């Protein structure tokens, strides 16, 4: 059922570059819409953006489209984020999200294990 | 971007007793019939796990005691009484676009 | 009294009145249900016989009096001054349901100004979870709940079906088609407002306008040869059809629905002018020219499931079955998503249903309105605009019981039992008083002299046998046979198919109600009373 899982964590520096995964299965990832979230102690969650395998469509805000930048590949069942110019406030844990559809208000069923951004 | 809020910041929910969440907003959401608010279970280091569909429909895998209803610019996530194992903090979910926002959050204890 | 004034700008009125977008779904959705092409032949027969005398009638009554819809019958047979007031009464049941229509239409022209239109991928806003028309490598799963993208677009976007269960249960007041409302009423009121010449300098461009989007949409169609695949196996012949008589008398009805005699508006157009030696050409034109235009018009749509089909590797019966209206909006959605060429015909082509939409809404108004000004000096003299004013606050007061209801059980309702035996009776009881009471004899003594020649050998057969002869075989079968409608899986309760039977059958009562008082207070004998009312016999 949930297969959603992400890739190990990665070490940030002023100016780097992180590639976050998280593998699309357990359902039809060619139809839901995937999105992300953050997280830190202390403090809730928040939405990111959104993206779809196969079409590529992304809506951001929240001031996270200075260096938001999401990618998907229908054909890997994959779906992939590049955060550049990384800073000390971004240390966070991310959760690869999926929204529900349409028929019952699109809530996020499945998630992931999530990978610490040390 | 939509505004959320919540209160009591605490609620003391002794065991044998019902409890009662909000979430407030300006807008005006209420668009084909579906209120887009719903609400996550959220517990130290396990991820989100999802309560109620639309704020009004109990979900599969979750139990019976959760519930929801109103009308308007103001819910409440009426709740049978409560196990201590279901001691989280929850969130009110907007998923009306372009902007998505969730709430303060509001601590479920004893 | 006001006149038209230039040729062709009176029979472009009568043009773009004959063209509805109910020949837009009628005849499409019925064809290939009677065989395809075997609908066609009879569609050929019955209107040379069936189209060409109940059309002329109205336009040849018209031409005769010059005297308005209701005091035309004090003339020839006075017992028959009801029916004016039945085509008033019918009218307003179909403008309900005709106005509610257009909203649709430029609801869509709104949202169709964006480049990357709500068609190629389901949003965070509707069922998505239903959408599954995506012709990818073989990933496609037909299920029972299975929709389109255009579907959704077309079900829960603007209808918002979801909420409504029935007739027994209305919905919300939905201030996006309500707006609508008042954009249709308003380029209609200043048409109308100012006088009837403004028409001779304003809607002589807008005939021409949607002849050219079919000719631009075929072009488009037949770029690729897989769509040209499609409708060689649409116009198979199956002539399996035509023994089995099913509802071939229905097939004479959608005629009778394309031309759409009786309703006083032909009659008001030709009141204005004698139209020596030229009406004759008029209904000549207007005849073969909308056997072209409803044959170009399904010519074109069931060309683009060729394309789609293709793909589908699926009968065209299958698809768009379940409902006349839905087969546009679905049809053409799917087209602009899948082809490169979006952001162009989109807009070109929502502009077809509007510029349709205000032609009948003016031409057919003019009927209307015309008959009850004739016979009210007192308003028709300084009370002209403000009257008219009035007439339009009672239109959309009655559109509102779709709208505000948040369905379309209205819509599917309203399109037998509206045009039922509601505008059957009312025509019938046109042609039998002009044929058999008043002489016909009399009536060619001085049409001839207005046409130049003598109208037997074409005129006497028709108006005599053939119209009493297919009108009567639309009442009695419709009885015999109730048409039993369905709208997105969902079975109407028997109780509601009575509240189309009797609106219908009540829409007329006007006709024997007013009789009855005419002949009551007329004093004397039996004889008498037919004598003094009936003044030729
Ligand atoms: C698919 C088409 C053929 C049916 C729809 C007819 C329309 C093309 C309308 C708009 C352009 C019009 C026409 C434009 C060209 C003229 C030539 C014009 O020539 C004359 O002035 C003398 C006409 C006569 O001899 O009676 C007469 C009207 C006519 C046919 C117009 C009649 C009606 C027309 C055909
Ligand atoms: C697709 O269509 C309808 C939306 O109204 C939904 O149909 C469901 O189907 C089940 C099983 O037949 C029935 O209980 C109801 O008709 C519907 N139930 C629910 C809970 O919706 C369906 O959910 C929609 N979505 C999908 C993915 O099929
Ligand atoms: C040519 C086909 C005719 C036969 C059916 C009825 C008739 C008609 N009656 C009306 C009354 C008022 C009105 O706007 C104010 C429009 C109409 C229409 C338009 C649609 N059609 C269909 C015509």
Redesign the pocket.
């Known amino acids: 059922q949930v297969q959603l899982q992400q890739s190990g964590p990665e070490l940030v520096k002023l100016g780097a570059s992180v590639r976050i995964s998280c593998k699309a299965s357990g359902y039809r990832f060619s139809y839901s819409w995937m999105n992300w979230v953050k997280q830190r102690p202390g403090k809730g969650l928040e939405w990111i953006g959104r993206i779809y395998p196969g079409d590529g469509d992304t809506k951001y805000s929240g001031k996270f489209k200075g260096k938001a930048t999401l990618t998907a590949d229908k054909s890997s069942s994959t779906v992939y984020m590049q955060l550049s110019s990384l800073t000390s406030e971004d240390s966070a844990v991310y959760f690869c999200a999926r929204s529900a559809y349409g028929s019952e208000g699109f809530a996020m069923d499945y998630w992931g294990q999530g990978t610490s951004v040390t | 971007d939509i505004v959320l809020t919540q209160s009591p910041a605490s609620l003391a929910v002794s065991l044998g007793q019902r409890a009662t969440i909000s979430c407030r907003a300006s807008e005006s959401v209420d668009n084909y019939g579906i209120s887009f608010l719903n609400w996550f279970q959220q517990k130290p280091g396990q991820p989100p796990k999802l309560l109620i569909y639309a704020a009004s429909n109990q979900g599969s895998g979750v139990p019976a005691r959760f519930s929801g209803s109103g009308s308007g610019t103001y819910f409440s996530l009426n709740i049978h009484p409560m196990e201590e194992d279901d001691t989280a903090v929850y969130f009110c979910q907007q998923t009306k676009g372009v902007s998505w926002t969730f709430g303060g959050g509001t601590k479920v204890e004893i | 009294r006001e006149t038209w004034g230039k040729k062709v700008d009176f029979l472009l009125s009568v043009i773009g009145?004959?063209v509805?977008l109910?020949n837009v779904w009628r005849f499409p959705y019925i064809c290939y249900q009677n065989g395809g092409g075997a609908f066609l032949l009879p569609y050929t027969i019955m209107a040379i016989f069936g189209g060409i005398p109940l059309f002329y009638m109205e336009l040849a009554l018209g031409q005769y009096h010059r005297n308005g819809c209701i005091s035309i019958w004090r003339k020839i047979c006075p017992i028959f001054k009801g029916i004016g007031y039945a085509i008033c009464i019918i009218?307003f049941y179909?403008?309900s349901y005709?106005n509610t229509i257009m909203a649709w239409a430029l609801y869509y022209l709104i949202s169709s100004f964006t480049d990357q239109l709500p068609w190629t991928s389901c949003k965070n806003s509707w069922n998505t979870g239903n959408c599954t028309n995506y012709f990818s490598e073989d990933n496609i799963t037909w299920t029972l709940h299975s929709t389109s993208p255009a579907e959704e677009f077309y079900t829960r976007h603007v209808l918002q079906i979801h909420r409504s269960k029935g007739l027994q249960d209305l919905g919300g007041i939905s201030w996006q088609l309500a707006l609508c409302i008042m954009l249709i009423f308003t380029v209609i009121y200043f048409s109308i407002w100012k006088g009837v010449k403004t028409s001779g300098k304003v809607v002589w461009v807008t005939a021409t306008f949607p002849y050219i989007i079919l000719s631009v949409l075929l072009v488009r169609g037949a770029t690729l040869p897989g769509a040209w695949r499609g409708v060689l196996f649409y116009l198979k012949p199956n002539w399996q059809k035509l023994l089995e008589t099913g509802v071939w008398i229905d097939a004479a009805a959608q005629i009778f629905?394309?031309?759409?005699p009786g309703?006083g508006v032909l009659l008001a157009f030709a009141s204005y002018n004698k139209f020596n030696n030229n009406c004759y050409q008029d209904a000549l034109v207007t005849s073969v020219v909308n056997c072209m235009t409803s044959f170009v018009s399904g010519f074109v749509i069931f060309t683009v499931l060729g394309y789609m089909a293709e793909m589908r590797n699926e009968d065209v019966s299958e698809v768009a079955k379940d409902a006349g209206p839905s087969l546009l909006f679905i049809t053409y959605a799917e087209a602009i998503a899948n082809m490169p060429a979006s952001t162009f015909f989109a807009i070109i082509f929502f502009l077809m249903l509007i510029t349709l939409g205000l032609d009948?809404?003016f031409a057919?108004?003019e009927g209307?309105i015309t008959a009850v000004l004739d016979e009210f000096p007192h308003v028709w003299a300084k009370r002209r605009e403000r009257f008219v004013l009035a007439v339009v606050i009672t239109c959309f007061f009655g559109s509102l019981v779709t709208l505000t209801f948040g369905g379309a059980y209205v819509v599917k309702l309203l399109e037998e039992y509206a045009?039922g035996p509601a505008?059957l009776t009312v025509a019938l009881i046109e042609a039998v008083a002009v044929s058999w009471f008043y002489g016909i004899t009399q009536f060619c003594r001085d049409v001839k002299e207005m046409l130049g020649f003598s109208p037997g050998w074409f005129w006497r057969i028709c108006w005599v046998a053939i119209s009493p002869l297919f009108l009567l075989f639309i009442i009695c079968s419709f009885l015999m046979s109730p048409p039993q409608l369905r709208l997105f899986q969902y079975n109407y309760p028997y109780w509601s198919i009575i509240l189309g039977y009797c609106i219908g059958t009540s829409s007329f009562i006007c006709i024997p109600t007013y009789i009855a008082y005419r002949l009551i207070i007329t004093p004397g004998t039996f004889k008498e009373r037919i004598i003094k009312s009936i003044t030729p016999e």
């Open positions: 009145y004959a509805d109910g009218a179909i403008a005709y629905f394309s031309l759409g309703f009948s809404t057919g108004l209307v045009t505008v």
